[PDB]
Structure 1
Amino acid sequence: NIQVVVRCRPFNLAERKASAHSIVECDPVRKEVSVRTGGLADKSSRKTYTFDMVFGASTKQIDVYRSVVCPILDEVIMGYNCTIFAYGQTGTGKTFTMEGERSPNEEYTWEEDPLAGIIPRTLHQIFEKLTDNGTEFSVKVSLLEIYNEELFDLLNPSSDVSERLQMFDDPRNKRGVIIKGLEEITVHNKDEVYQILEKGAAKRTTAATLMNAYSSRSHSVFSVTIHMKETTIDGEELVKIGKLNLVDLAGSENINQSLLTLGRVITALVERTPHVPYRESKLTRILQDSLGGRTRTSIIATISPASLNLEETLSTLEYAHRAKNILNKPEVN
């Protein structure tokens, strides 16, 4: 049973300039989201949905991390494979939540930036939790992006972001794949983190100037792999592996093969259709095990609070709510 949560961003300055009204109410306690749907015609009308967790407009980055990620990171350290992906309309906060942003000027260090998202906070915790705990461990990260069914490597040594990756079925996993050419960087300590992310963002910036509407049409896949040593009571040394995939999806409002097959894959699972079209898109092949497989999965549905985005917001809520019916069978590696 996959976890689905909703995060509503606060109004932006443009919306206030236009006197935007709010049509969203979040109730963390009852874990519900209620939408005002009749504007001027019917003031009482509304659509209420129930999710595993709800975060209102005032929710801060650190709140999302403590509530959603902490539990997931524990599962990863326990030797599980987990996936968190953001789904939502362009401009609602997918990237802001998954990666976050850097505060202007010095002001804050990357480890203390209030605006930092899930990726930076997670990599920081991995080193903090595992170091102040003993345990021999090694951390490896990768960041690829899908655009028009083509795969680009943001952490690759080559200076040209357009050099393409390839995908193949993983011989040792019926529902897993191998990314040929992918650069998996070993992160020796937290002091090596920021440089890797900074290089990553730089190559992404170059890619957005190379392809049309890159930022909103692409899918971003960040993966973290942890190898940890365990010694049984008998003195046997073995290695448990934990893996975390942090995915920032293309805008739902929508080169659309992956987003399209994703919806198709979800529908097939909730309706129990015989054949699930995983093979039909680069995205669903990478996430196959996350959708009905052995990976612990959580979805963060992002929405705007404005009356103007009513239709899309309802669409996002409806889509994410169906997703609650997808069942997975988590299994340690």
Structure 2
Amino acid sequence: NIQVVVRCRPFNLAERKASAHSIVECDPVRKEVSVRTGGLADKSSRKTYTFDMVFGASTKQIDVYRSVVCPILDEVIMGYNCTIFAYGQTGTGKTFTMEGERSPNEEYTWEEDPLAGIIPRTLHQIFEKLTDNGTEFSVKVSLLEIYNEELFDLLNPSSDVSERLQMFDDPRNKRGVIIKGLEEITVHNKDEVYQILEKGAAKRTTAATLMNAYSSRSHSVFSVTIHMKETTIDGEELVKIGKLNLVDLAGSENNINQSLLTLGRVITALVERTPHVPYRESKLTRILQDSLGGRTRTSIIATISPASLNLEETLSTLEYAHRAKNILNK
């Protein structure tokens, strides 16, 4: 049930000038990614994996959006909860995929930059889809990050990143939590999107000078909640509420990351049908437990490098992403 897709990033400039040989090969039509485990392009051993979808190095941001994000967003608009994880070693594209970047030299506006990732595209498309049709709606965003098992709010513009948030169990709905003090920013319109994201980037920058290897070791949960009151051309009123969680996981490479460690143990228990699932052994899994064998539709985008240097890690990621396919929720 849980959908897993692989995205291999292309060689960088440093690898181009050094004329690197890819040890990875993607076959989209056959949902397969093959890795050269022994060595030699003239002769060698290989490891093959089949996923729900595979995107090679030539894959652009727009292809990922139209193929994976567009459908999941439609479900969110129908009043469903959805989660998308980015998993992989540091430097393989987790952030590029989830957030994206700006083309150099102010060549485009944020709405047309082809390097934009899932988050900016999604927020722009929500206003694009709902403004057209006859739908009343409000959009709230929240960016919750975890570092060394502490919670930080990267959007509240009146607190510094030195102020950690407290988490409690929600006495109302079971297997859910309450983050005391988490800010929910209302995004009144499309032309309010960019600055909200810029605010988070800046606050993030201070978080980085305050905590060691912050961008590598933390988990970022960027959520978008949509309260909708649709009125068909007839006069029917549909009151739906969708929530989409975009999670940029800590680098999977190997102090300790309790949330990362627990995510793997939770997945293991879920696929091996073990009765006890360690959701409570980390903040990440308590916050997103409904996305792990719960009533949420979740997808996992595993990112990998094509360089022969990252062989061991590319195999761990692929092997990890494959087992996750067996998780069943709803």
* TM class by smaller structure: over 0.9
Between the aligned partners of 1:258 and 1:210, the Cα distance in structure 2 is 20
1:22-72 alpha-carbon deviations (Å, 9 max, x no partner): 111100100100111111499231111111110000100011000000000
Tell me the CA shift for residue 227 of structure 1: 0.5
Tell me the CA shift for residue 21 of structure 1: 1.4
Is the Cα contact below 8 Å between 1:62 and 1:114 reproduced in 2?
yes
Is the Cα contact below 8 Å between 2:271 and 2:327 reproduced in 1?
yes
The TM-score normalised by the length of structure 1 is 0.95
1:137-162 alpha-carbon deviations (Å, 9 max, x no partner): 11000011100001111100224112
Tell me the CA shift for residue 167 of structure 1: 1.1
1:80-103 alpha-carbon deviations (Å, 9 max, x no partner): 000001000000000000000112
Between the aligned partners of 1:299 and 1:167, the Cα distance in structure 2 is 25
Tell me the CA shift for residue 198 of structure 1: 0.4
Between the aligned partners of 1:288 and 1:159, the Cα distance in structure 2 is 28
SS at match of 1:164: coil
Between the aligned partners of 1:249 and 1:75, the Cα distance in structure 2 is 23
Label 1:33 to 1:189 Cα distance change in 2 as closer, same or farther (>3 A): same
Tell me the CA shift for residue 200 of structure 1: 0.4
1:220-278 alpha-carbon deviations (Å, 9 max, x no partner): 10000001114599967552100000000000008400000000000000001111000
Is the Cα contact below 8 Å between 2:140 and 2:185 reproduced in 1?
yes
Is the Cα contact below 8 Å between 1:147 and 1:255 reproduced in 2?
no
Is the Cα contact below 8 Å between 2:134 and 2:232 reproduced in 1?
no
Is the Cα contact below 8 Å between 1:87 and 1:302 reproduced in 2?
yes
Is the Cα contact below 8 Å between 1:149 and 1:255 reproduced in 2?
no
1:203-228 alpha-carbon deviations (Å, 9 max, x no partner): 00111111111110000100000011
Label 1:273 to 1:42 Cα distance change in 2 as closer, same or farther (>3 A): farther
The TM-score normalised by the length of structure 2 is 0.96
Whether 1:88 and 2:88 are equivalent positions in the alignment is yes
Between the aligned partners of 2:100 and 2:288, the Cα distance in structure 1 is 22
Is the Cα contact below 8 Å between 1:226 and 1:242 reproduced in 2?
yes
Label 1:304 to 1:225 Cα distance change in 2 as closer, same or farther (>3 A): same
Between the aligned partners of 1:19 and 1:215, the Cα distance in structure 2 is 29
Tell me the CA shift for residue 195 of structure 1: 0.7
Is the Cα contact below 8 Å between 2:87 and 2:94 reproduced in 1?
yes
1:166-201 alpha-carbon deviations (Å, 9 max, x no partner): 111223321221111011001110011111000000
SS at match of 1:126: helix
Label 1:232 to 1:123 Cα distance change in 2 as closer, same or farther (>3 A): closer
Whether 1:99 and 2:90 are equivalent positions in the alignment is no
User: Number of matched residues?
Assistant: 329
Between the aligned partners of 1:13 and 1:143, the Cα distance in structure 2 is 32
Structure 2: segments with no counterpart, 5+ residues: none
Whether 1:186 and 2:160 are equivalent positions in the alignment is no
| Residue range with higher mean Cα deviation, 234-243 or 93-102 | 234-243
Is the Cα contact below 8 Å between 2:134 and 2:231 reproduced in 1?
no
Is the Cα contact below 8 Å between 2:134 and 2:230 reproduced in 1?
no
Aligned identity (percent) is 100
Is the Cα contact below 8 Å between 1:25 and 1:56 reproduced in 2?
yes
Is the Cα contact below 8 Å between 1:146 and 1:152 reproduced in 2?
yes
Tell me the CA shift for residue 14 of structure 1: 1.9
Between the aligned partners of 1:130 and 1:20, the Cα distance in structure 2 is 46
Aligned-residue CA RMSD (Å): 1.7
Between the aligned partners of 2:17 and 2:231, the Cα distance in structure 1 is 61
SS at match of 2:256: coil
Between the aligned partners of 2:145 and 2:43, the Cα distance in structure 1 is 43
Tell me the CA shift for residue 105 of structure 1: 2.5
Tell me the CA shift for residue 311 of structure 1: 0.7
Is the Cα contact below 8 Å between 1:290 and 1:296 reproduced in 2?
yes
Label 1:264 to 1:112 Cα distance change in 2 as closer, same or farther (>3 A): same
Tell me the CA shift for residue 16 of structure 1: 2.5
Structure 1: segments with no counterpart, 5+ residues: none
| Residue range with higher mean Cα deviation, 53-62 or 171-180 | 171-180
Is the Cα contact below 8 Å between 1:139 and 1:227 reproduced in 2?
yes
Between the aligned partners of 2:276 and 2:266, the Cα distance in structure 1 is 9
SS at match of 1:229: strand
Between the aligned partners of 1:66 and 1:204, the Cα distance in structure 2 is 29
Is the Cα contact below 8 Å between 1:175 and 1:289 reproduced in 2?
yes
